[PDB]
Amino acid sequence: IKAFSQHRRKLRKTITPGTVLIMLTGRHRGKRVVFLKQLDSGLLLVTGPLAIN
Amino acid sequence: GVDIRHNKDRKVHRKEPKSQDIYLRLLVKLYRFLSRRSDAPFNKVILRRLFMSKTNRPPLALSRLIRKMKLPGRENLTAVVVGTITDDVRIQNIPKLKVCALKVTDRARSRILKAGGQIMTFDQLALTSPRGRGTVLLSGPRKGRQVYRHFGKAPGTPHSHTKPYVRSKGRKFERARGRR
Amino acid sequence: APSRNGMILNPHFHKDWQKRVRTWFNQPARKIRRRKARQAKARRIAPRPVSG
Amino acid sequence: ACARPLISVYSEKGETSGKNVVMPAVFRAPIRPDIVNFVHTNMRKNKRQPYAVSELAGHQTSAESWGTGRAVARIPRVRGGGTHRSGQGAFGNMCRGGRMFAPTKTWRRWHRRVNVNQKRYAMCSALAASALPSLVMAKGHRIEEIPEVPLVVDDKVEGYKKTKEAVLLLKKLKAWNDIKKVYASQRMRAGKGKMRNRRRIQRKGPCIIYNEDNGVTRAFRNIPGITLQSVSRLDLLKLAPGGHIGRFCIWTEGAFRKLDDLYGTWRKASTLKVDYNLPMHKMSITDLNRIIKSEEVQKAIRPANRKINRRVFKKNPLKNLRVMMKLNPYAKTARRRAIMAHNPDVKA
Amino acid sequence: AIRAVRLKKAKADKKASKVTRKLIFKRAEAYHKEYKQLYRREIRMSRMARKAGNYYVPAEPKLAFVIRIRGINGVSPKVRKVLQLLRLRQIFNGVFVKLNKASINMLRIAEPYIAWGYPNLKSVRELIYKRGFGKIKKQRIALTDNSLIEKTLGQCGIICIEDLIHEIYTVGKNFKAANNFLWPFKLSSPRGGMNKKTTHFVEGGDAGNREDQINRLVRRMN
Amino acid sequence: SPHLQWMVIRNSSSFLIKRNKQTYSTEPNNLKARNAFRFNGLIHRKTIGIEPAADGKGVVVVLKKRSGQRKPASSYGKITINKNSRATLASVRNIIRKNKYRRDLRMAALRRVSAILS
Amino acid sequence: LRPLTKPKIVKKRTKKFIRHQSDRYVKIRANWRKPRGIDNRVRRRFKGQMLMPNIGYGSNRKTKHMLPSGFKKFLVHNVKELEVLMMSNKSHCAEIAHNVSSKNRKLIVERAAQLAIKVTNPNAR
Amino acid sequence: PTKKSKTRKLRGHVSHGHGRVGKHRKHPGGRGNAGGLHHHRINFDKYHPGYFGKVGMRHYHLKRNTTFCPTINLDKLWTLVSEQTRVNYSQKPDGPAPIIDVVRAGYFKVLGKGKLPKQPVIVKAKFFSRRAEEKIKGVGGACVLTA
RNA sequence: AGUUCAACAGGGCGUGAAACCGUUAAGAGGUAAACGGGUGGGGACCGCCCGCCCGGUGGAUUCAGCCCGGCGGGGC
RNA sequence: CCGAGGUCCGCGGCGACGCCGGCCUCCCACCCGACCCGUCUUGAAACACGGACCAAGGAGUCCAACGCGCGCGCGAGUCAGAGGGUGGCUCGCGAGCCCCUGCGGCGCAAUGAAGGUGAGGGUGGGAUCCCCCCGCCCCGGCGG
RNA sequence: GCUGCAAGCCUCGACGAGUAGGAGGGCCGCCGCGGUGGCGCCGAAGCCCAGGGCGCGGGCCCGGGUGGAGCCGCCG
């Protein structure tokens, strides 16, 4: 029953630094973004870049 | 579904005294504690008999109590009976008994005490002998009631010796056809 | 009528017994009545014993 | 039984009078609410009048059933005529204006006789309950300020002749709160009992047991809730109202003294009753805590087991590793040699 | 003092629990290699007979696993009494039966209602591990710890769950107490269905005796 | 004889309230107003009664005296504790714990003092 | 005024157990009556008929008689009956009876606010 | 009363505890002791053998005060006197013996069932059995007759 | 219009249920109507962070330990 | 931590009714299920009977005696039944209290048509209990 | 810490069809009585309700409307 900060973080093999992801939710739906890094909470650090999309 | 019969699931055993007697239910609360934690086989039999009805706790005559005391090895042991100790006018001597019963009749109380005896209640028995050590648990003649003379095969069967239900015992009362 | 072992009963209720049923509701009232009669008789025979 | 303290007598005020009375043994008789409720059920049944319907009710009709052949329902119908009554059901209990089912007859068993020894047994338990502060307060009587629960007053109370003398005594003994409780309860009865001379209902106040009537009954007569009783004739219906024990009883010194001879101690039988004595206790020590916590009983019982054994939820040993090595310690060694078997290590 | 004798005993029972922990370890380790020797021995006996041109008839199986396949309504009174003595009172429950002429003729007389066979070690092992429940005091208690087996079957030398597996797979002098200690295995419905329930296994159904094919039925019901 | 008296008023008493699948006892010396042998306030020789003062300030602690058993006018002693929360709880906790007076009602009395001070 | 604990009250059935054929007659009230007819569809529990209340529908003993607010209802008639809920006010809520007057209903709401006791019908007049 | 009555739990049940096939009707087998020889014969013969027929002589004007003979056994013989009386004469067995007049106590005949304590006693009764007398004679004492 | 606290007490008049009926409001209607289970829509009336301890902070403490004096109470 | 069954020491948009919530119940709609109850009957949805609708009424009672079970009192006794006594100018209270040299009933003796006569432990199983012996002890007990 | 209404509370395991019929429980319901605890012209009983709820259920509580003088809980 460890806290969320102590849970182990999963990450699919298809998500490596530099892959092009497709956001399915939010306001940037379908926008193809660039995956940079996975943060400590498992959430992915995603950039557009801004000057593209 | 499970191939079982639920006919004998309810074990018909009295688990509490049918009576609303305040003093009897305190003895039940006193001996339910001893039956749980004392781990003595005597306190378990007393707990059953504290539940039982009047017919299952028949009177114990003074003479019958004395005979079971005069048996070998019962010198200083106390006579325990969950019920009443009735006096027996047929017996003459009382050998200084030490009884413990729910009730003792006035003459059985006077004759036991006059002989130098000691009458105890089941709260004193639990106080002086919680394990039930040094006791002789006695019961009355349960089959001594009149209803058991009518219990049997049937009055109109061979080798019956069963008492029929007749209004009066006389000459013209069920003695003509089948009794000779 | 007979079900199992039991007495052969003989209730004598084959007449019109409901027409002749005496209830003892005045039993304590006749005790007060008979008591007043002894007291009333006692004053009438004041010196003499009341029992007769 | 042997717990017979020295009860003090109180004067016309709420203070002691210097006199002391030994507690009668009747107040140490076995308290049997089941016996009191049994005798009260049948004793209160003996003062009731018989009620019954008329034997002719519903049978004043010369009704004959029309039989079959008509759409009518084969019930005895009233003879013909030019009235509404003609052609109506007359006898059955389902018919309007007919005879009720099993009409209430006046010769039912209205009165129940109780064994004289059981009447006295219930009275011994009712008096013993009036000497306990718990049973009198739980009864409903406001005695939180009276000087003593068995309340014995001087014999001059029997000589009272005016109500103001009686009301002032009840104020000195602080028993007046039990009478203000009666005033606060005087209300109207719920139901059709008001149509039957039972309109106003109230509560029960302190009962006053006397010995010699020198005017005490007329002095306390006009006070609501007050019940006056001679010590020789104590009614259980008034000393155990509603079948409940714990009636607030204000005793007189003359009545408190004579109470010892009316029922007698266990040592000497009663002198005012032919061949009677108090019931015997089937339990001398009624304090279970004194028995259980005694030295001899504590030496006989095991230590109390206070380890609640929950249900051990079963996990699959074939899927879960730690519950398998808990059952089969060798499984870890067998698993290690089986995991190493999938490693291509070259032997000699 | 009392605290000293209780702490000394607490450390003594803690030390006696480790030697019993090692006892059931080497015992389960010796049981495992016995299963290997018994498996390799039947191969050696079969090989030496074929090399001489003869045949090696293995010992007839001494253990059986009986599964009640038919329901409870409409049972013949003779078959109904036999299923009660096999502790098979509902559908899809399993028991181990020590095979002898007294047992085989009971399995033949209740044949249309059961589907039994010869369980292997994996069947006996997985049934007592996944479906294993003990009868402690007429109660169905899950075999979650070896203390529950040692408390009841400790007199028979069965103190661990591998002792219960070894005493049943290789039936021993204490098979009756060990098998009766195990509550009837409440098996699930056969995943994948059955061929047909009202027919014998030889004629295309499932009832009767399937020699070693009962293991296929166990993997699908357990 | 409390165990004897409990069997008499466990189901029949003027202070007992039975409704809504619940039961409550309204005797003045009941801490939790609970119908139980442990909490009944007129049955034992040692009862702890805790009520608010005549004014809305303080807590009057009622203790059943040893000699006032059959004398209701001189059966209880009134102890008015009009202090802060910690001081009032400390006074009642020492009356129960350090006098060994009805120790089974220690926390039940502390929760009642803490209740009538709000 | 929150309760001590507010668990998830799971109810096995929220519909009433309406009496069989109570829709076809006004004389047949919706109050449940066990059908005892020899050919009754509901008694024989045929498929698609009215359900019969059995003990299987019993609610969890931890949440029985528990109001949606988590409290347990207790009827009161005066401020004396209100002070019995002083202790255990995190599990039982008071409910002023219907037959009380508006004058006495104001005193109970005032006293319950002091004792931190919840009233289900505070403003009822 | 009617609160604990069985009819209170039969409300709603049609046949009221008397069956649908065989209803509860008005005397389906006769009234009273009907058919005691024809269709209730098995019940009468099984539970009341001897119910039918005559046995013995008839006594027209039988007066129970003529055959009044209350009996008492020897085990309850000393109950007619006080316990102190039986003990006082036990220490004086050399001739002073108590007299137990059984007639004035309400009995006529003395039967010798129980054992008698080893004390001489003079028993006055209207009748004595053979064994009652010899037990009184054997224990010491006489059996005085009275009318 | 008027009397009455009230005509939701107007004369077979206290309360005024059900069946039945008029009207209004709302919706629906080719498988007689109703009914069980599941859900959907609509409608009518409703409904809706604190406690303990501790750390500092800045204002008030008929201010605390302890002592003294008086009183009360407690025990296998 | 693959260990005596769950926690987050993770979080988002809306929160004063406009755009939030109301299981069930009201209306409506759809899918699945679904023949009218009662009754007798082997078998009822029956082309078997009763029932147009609604309200109110409407059917296991009381008495006697018996049986068994249970509660209670006392106990080889038990019940006081008719009656009597009396808190005395009698409410509640036609209750309750009290004593009847306890009449009598039913028990304490049966058996015979009657005249009549009239009742002295053993073995086996057995709750419980008693004693002895050997270990252990937390001195109270536990084990054999 | 909580309970200990011991007729209470807690733990574990298995089980659950039913006419005729039997038994048990009922803080189901109705009328009156002895007790006890109340309620009411600031509005009881009864009646009505597309309001809020409780109980497996029998039924119950609350709110609103109407009504106008009595009524209810608990132990028997």
Ligand SMILES: [Mg+2]
């Ligand atoms: Mg018959």
Ligand SMILES: [Mg+2]
């Ligand atoms: Mg016609």
Ligand SMILES: [Mg+2]
């Ligand atoms: Mg009429």
Ligand SMILES: [Mg+2]
């Ligand atoms: Mg009414």
Ligand SMILES: [Mg+2]
């Ligand atoms: Mg079949």
Ligand SMILES: [Mg+2]
């Ligand atoms: Mg077939």
Ligand SMILES: [Mg+2]
């Ligand atoms: Mg519901």
Ligand SMILES: [Mg+2]
């Ligand atoms: Mg309807």
Ligand SMILES: [Mg+2]
């Ligand atoms: Mg049928």
Ligand SMILES: [Mg+2]
């Ligand atoms: Mg039925």
Ligand SMILES: [Mg+2]
């Ligand atoms: Mg019929």
Ligand SMILES: [Mg+2]
């Ligand atoms: Mg019947």
Ligand SMILES: [Mg+2]
């Ligand atoms: Mg027939």
Ligand SMILES: [Mg+2]
């Ligand atoms: Mg008949």
Ligand SMILES: [Mg+2]
């Ligand atoms: Mg009006």
Ligand SMILES: [Mg+2]
């Ligand atoms: Mg009007």
